[PDB]
Amino acid sequence: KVFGRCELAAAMKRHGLDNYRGYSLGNWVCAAKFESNFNTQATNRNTDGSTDYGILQINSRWWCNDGRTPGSRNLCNIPCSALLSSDITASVNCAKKIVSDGNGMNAWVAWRNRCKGTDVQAWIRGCR
Ligand SMILES: C[C@@H](O)CN1CCN(CC(=O)O)CCN(CC(=O)O)CCN(CC(=O)O)CC1
Ligand SMILES: C[C@@H](O)CN1CCN(CC(=O)O)CCN(CC(=O)O)CCN(CC(=O)O)CC1
Ligand SMILES: [Cl-]
Ligand SMILES: [Cl-]
Ligand SMILES: [Cl-]
Ligand SMILES: [Gd]
Ligand code: NA
């Protein structure tokens, strides 16, 4: 699924992501735009042999199982394939663990370089 801006904000907000660990709802919609282009099916291969999956590009090294990342952890206890669903539940519960882990939203390289220190509220502007 390719999400609209307002449509993804309302879904993230219903899954409780809004002000989670003090990160406003604009920081999250920001990250998804630059990580996936709002596309739940996005995949990207990393040079170490791990792969990032879904709208927040969650990495197979620590967070889920794709059966081809040797001696890696599955700390979300999910197949990576589940992070590719039109239903963003899996991706959101899995991001709640990552953003809590000590480094906050810096785990997302596109958030650090394109959203951190910007007017993030602009990303939910106009939505009901
Ligand atoms: C809502 C309209 O903006 C729709 N829009 C009309 C064309 N716009 C004109 C403009 O943005 O005033 C210029 C192109 N636009 C550049 C950008 O927005 O950064 C990329 C395409 N956009 C992507 C999006 O906006 O989500 C969809 C088409
Ligand atoms: C021509 C405009 O499209 C210029 N635009 C600024 C105004 N936009 C317009 C809008 O989308 O209605 C609203 C804010 N915008 C939200 C979003 O677009 O996703 C984030 C910033 N954008 C990023 C981008 O466009 O890729 C910068 C360029
Ligand atoms: Cl915001
Ligand atoms: Cl594996
Ligand atoms: Cl933090
Ligand atoms: Gd924009
Ligand atoms: Na793994």
> How is 29-43 classified by DSSP, letter by letter?
HHHHHHHHSSBTT-E
Environment of ion ligand 3 (residues, CB < 5 A): 24-26, 121
- The enclosing H or E element of 10 equals helix 5-14
Provide the terminal-to-terminal Cα distance of the chain, rounded to the nearest Å.
22
Experimental technique: X-ray
The bridge status of strand 43-45 relative to strand 51-53 is antiparallel
What whole-number distance in Å separates Cα of residue 16 and Cα of residue 126? 20
Residues paired with 65 in a beta bridge: 79
How far CA 91 is from CA of 9, 71, 108, in Å, comes to: 14, 22, 14
Q: Does residue 123 have its Cβ closer than 6 Å to ligand 2? A: yes
Ligand 2 closest atom vs CA 29:
19
**Resolution of the experimental model, in Å, one decimal:** 2.3
Q: What's the CA gap between 40 and 78, in Å, rounded?
A: 16
Sign of CA dihedral 54, 59, 63, 68: positive
Residue with CA closest to ligand 2 atom 11: 123
CB 87 within 8 A of CB 78: no
Beginning with the edge strand found earlier in the chain, give each strand of the sheet holding 51-53 in spatial order: 43-45, 51-53, 58-59
What is the DSSP code string of 57-115? Answer: TEETTTS-B-S-STT---TT-SBGGGGGSSS-HHHHHHHHHHHTSSSGGGGSHHHHHHT
* Gap between the Cα atoms of 6 and 61, Å rounded: 31
* Whether 99 contacts 24, CB under 8 Å: no
Tell me which residues are annotated as active site: 35, 52
Taking the centre of ligand 1 as the mean of its atom positions, its distance from the CA of residue 44, in whole angstroms, is 25
1-128, which class in CATH?
Answer: mainly alpha
